[PDB]
Design a protein around this ligand. Structure first.
Ligand SMILES: Nc1cc(C(F)(F)F)c(-c2nc(N3CCOCC3)nc(N3CC(CO)(CCl)C3)n2)cn1
Length: 811
């Protein structure tokens, strides 16, 4: 169809990659997955309620935290309602359903719905008012809930239209420009089954061996998902699945173009070949050589328990693995032992694998066990290639409500890189949950699109998954995405053009002019906050920041007239940094906020919105009324920070609340940063709001100091490096309370941290340990409770020693 060709082009401009192209495939894995990602799509699309899908209500089935209970005194909630400059307040009970509120309101005077004023956010569905996120947001922030009664959005325009051994031939290598040898492996889950090599020849434009590298593994022994790893060093690598998606073995000859090093990493596992054929190193290989689906003594059981108890970081001895394996059925009764057990499997042996799959038959204990996202994630990392082991983990995620899928959505999207094949249980899980919820689908869009734009190694796999989502999300979503992408390209253009014109009066004139040139969509959704829409630019408020990379400071008008405030939406555009690192960290900070919601804690973290759009290019949310701690100091005497708060405080009451939130916010970042090992930062990278909320920024690429707690912060808490103030005791306990709450989620944090380094960093093995030592693994609470207080003292014993040094390095 002529219309289908123009439609596919819409998806191509949206996705930023052409899926129909078959220039860089040696097989049909991609296309087969497209055909295979039609059934799952239609299955979720044909099974979704248009009404609830069109308004995409954001809710949680979790209990309301202890601290958020104090906010409600009379067991009633105030819901200000709007129709046209008219206000009708309604005192309401925490359990009052949105429907009841509609009739309970009309009585004081049922076709319409309560929409949040100035937002594409609705309060609809059989849910208590207390369970809506926008409601919990207002309580936490003291704001009141303003709502407008409007027609429920039309779901109409959401609609979609042998026993022989193995061998391989190393013919040679070829690079057009610029002692090197070949290294061939057979890997399953980053675990080497066998390794062969060649003879070192001098580095030149042409070096060939044509050697026959023989393997010890046998044809029926080869596990599904097994990769053929080919490497070269004196610095190039490529892979290829020994088994395709149809259970067929690799028959034929292959010319493969290789990736190069820039000096473990998610990229090293990719089954995709290098797109650039003009400059890349190539490999010559040929392959010519199907499948189907008494108890322990308590002394050994005690040893097995000790092994199960240890962390995910603790390596497994050959002694342990044999113990875990010989006692499979005792190990099966402990879900926490599944990662270590499946690591004890000889995947290079068909007879054992069969025992493995047979073992997975009766998963009575696994399927009944409470979901452990830390335990589930472990089965999804680089150390597991078995399609069925991963399937039981993805099976467990399905119980997750949309609320929790949002918290872990970024890590899940990244975990796709660890999948041996393009079509996986995980990729189908992401697709289902994306098509089932508009908010999940919105972020799934930008997460996929961030990788597709700056990742040569995986852009193909993600493009196919993004295409499968674009069809099925709806005609309405497609319009928004088109607008959003349209604006970001115009802004990124301006951002890049502005950056080059500077290493002034000249640039400031160039900015306003080029901004007046765009004058382009009338409105678009904010990528990091889909509820908000943006209008025309506040060109007068727009400016290039006095920062080293010349970042664009932009402000927009809100396109919603139903908004009480007149505030502009601020966004920063930056080409200097790699905002992928920032995304992961910020998302981990949100996960930390959730964990502290478990023990009923608020630390007032400010995980501002951040989205990577291209290569070292993206956007950051602007937190209103925030300034840098450094800027407060210059234009290092201690009392400065306190003068600022009282200055920005209209009343003495405002000041006290600003001091309170500072004690919490400071405590939150002190604990969070030290764990992630990013505690040592300069003043410029730590900001504060006029309302007392402290927060950090710029998380890309990171003597000594545990974390930042300078004398000015101490002074705002009223302590001169020796005494203990009333607020300081509050802070010093809050740190311990919050630090103990994270040790309880050690495995979850480690696995997240481990994945963040592999899929989001450029070795990899030793770097992970800091979070293990920081979390004080294998130590009682009190001894650990002191370890953190000792870390606080190292900040007191220090002062500006490193902070002054930081001032020295930049200059
Ligand atoms: N990777 C990055 C990059 C930046 C960058 F480019 F500097 F803007 C930031 C950043 N975020 C932020 N904030 C994000 C949250 O809302 C407040 C602004 N501010 C600032 N600036 C302080 C400034 C120079 O001194 C003028 Cl006020 C510019 N920088 C964070 N992470």
């Amino acid at each position: 169809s002529e219309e289908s060709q123009a439609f596919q082009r819409q998806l191509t401009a949206l996705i930023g990659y052409d899926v129909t192209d078959v220039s860089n495939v040696h097989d049909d894995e991609l296309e087969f997955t497209r055909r295979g990602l039609v059934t799952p799509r239609m299955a979720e699309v044909a099974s979704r309620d248009p009404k609830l899908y069109a308004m995409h209500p954001w809710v949680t089935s979790k209990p309301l935290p202890e601290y958020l209970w104090k906010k409600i005194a009379n067991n009633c909630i105030f819901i200000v309602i709007h129709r046209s400059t008219t206000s009708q307040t309604i005192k309401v009970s925490p359990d009052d359903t949105p429907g009841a509120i509609l009739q309970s309101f009309f009585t004081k005077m049922q076709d319409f719905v309560l929409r949040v004023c100035g937002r594409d956010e609705y309060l609809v569905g059989e849910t208590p008012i207390k369970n809506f996120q926008w409601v919990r947001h207002c309580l936490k922030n003291g704001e009141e809930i303003h709502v407008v009664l409007d027609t429920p959005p039309d779901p109409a325009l959401d609609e979609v239209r042998c026993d022989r051994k193995f061998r391989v031939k190393i013919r040679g290598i070829d690079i057009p420009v610029l002692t090197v040898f070949v290294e061939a492996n057979i890997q399953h889950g980053q675990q080497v089954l066998c390794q062969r090599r060649t003879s070192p020849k001098p580095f030149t434009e042409e070096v060939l061996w044509n050697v026959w590298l023989e393997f010890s593994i046998k044809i029926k022994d080869l596990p599904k998902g097994a990769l053929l790893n080919l490497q070269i060093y004196c610095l190039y690598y490529v892979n290829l699945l020994l088994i395709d998606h149809r259970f067929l073995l690799r028959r034929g000859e292959y010319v493969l173009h290789m990736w190069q090093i820039s000096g473990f990493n998610a990229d090293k596992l990719t089954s995709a070949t290098n797109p650039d054929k003009e400059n890349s190193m190539s490999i010559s290989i040929l392959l010519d050589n199907h499948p189907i689906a008494a108890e322990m003594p308590n002394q050994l059981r005690k040893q097995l328990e000790a092994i199960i108890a240890t962390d995910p970081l603790n390596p497994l001895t050959a002694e342990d693995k044999e113990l875990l394996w010989h006692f499979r059925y005792e190990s099966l009764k402990h879900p926490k032992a599944y990662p270590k057990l499946f690591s004890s499997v000889k995947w290079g042996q068909q007879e054992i694998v069969a025992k493995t799959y047979q073992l997975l038959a009766r998963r009575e204990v696994w399927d009944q066990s409470a979901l452990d996202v830390g335990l589930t994630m472990q089965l999804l990392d680089c150390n597991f290639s078995d399609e069925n082991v991963r399937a039981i983990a993805v099976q467990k995620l399905e119980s997750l409500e949309d609320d929790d899928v949002l918290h872990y959505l970024l890590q899940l999207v990244q975990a796709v890189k660890f999948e041996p094949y393009h079509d996986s249980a995980l990729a189908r899980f992401l697709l289902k949950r994306g098509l089932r919820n508009k908010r999940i689908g919105h972020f799934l869009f930008w997460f996929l699109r961030s990788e597709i734009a700056q990742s040569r190694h995986y852009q193909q796999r993600f493009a196919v998954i993004l295409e499968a989502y674009l069809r099925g999300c709806g005609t309405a979503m497609l319009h928004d995405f088109t607008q959003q992408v349209q604006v970001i390209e115009m802004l990124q253009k301006v951002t890049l053009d502005i950056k080059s014109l500077s290493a002034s009066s000249q640039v400031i004139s160039q900015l306003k002019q080029k901004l007046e040139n765009l004058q382009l969509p009338e409105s678009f959704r904010v990528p990091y906050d889909p509820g908000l829409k943006a209008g025309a630019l506040a060109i007068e408020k727009c400016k290039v920041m006095a920062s080293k990379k010349k970042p664009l400071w932009l402000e927009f008008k809100c396109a919603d007239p139903t908004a009480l405030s007149n505030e502009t939406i601020g966004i920063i555009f930056k080409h200097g940094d790699d905002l992928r690192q920032d995304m992961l960290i910020l998302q981990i900070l949100r996960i930390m906020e959730s964990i502290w919601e478990t023990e009923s804690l608020d630390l007032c973290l400010l995980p501002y919105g951040c989205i990577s759009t291209g290569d070292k290019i993206g956007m950051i949310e602007i937190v209103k009324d925030a300034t840098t701690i450094a800027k407060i100091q210059q234009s290092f005497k201690d009392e400065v920070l306190n003068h600022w708060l009282k200055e920005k405080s209209p009343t003495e009451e405002k000041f006290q609340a600003a001091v309170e939130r500072f004690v919490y916010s400071c405590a939150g970042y002190c604990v969070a940063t030290f764990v992630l090992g990013i505690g040592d930062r300069h003043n410029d990278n730590i900001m504060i709001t006029e309302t007392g909320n402290l927060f950090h920024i710029d998380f890309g690429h990171i003597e000594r100091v545990p974390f930042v707690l300078t004398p000015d912060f101490l002074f705002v808490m009223g302590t001169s490096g020796k005494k203990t103030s009333p607020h300081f005791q509050k802070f010093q306990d809050i740190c311990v309370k919050a630090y103990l709450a994270l040790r309880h989620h050690t495995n979850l944090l480690i696995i997240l941290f481990s994945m963040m380094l592999m899929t989001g960093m450029p070795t990899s093995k030793e770097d992970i340990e800091y979070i293990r030592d920081a979390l004080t693994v294998g130590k009682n609470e009190e001894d650990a409770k002191k370890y953190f207080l000792d870390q606080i003292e190292v900040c007191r014993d220090k002062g500006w020693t490193v902070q002054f040094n930081w001032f020295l390095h930049l200059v």
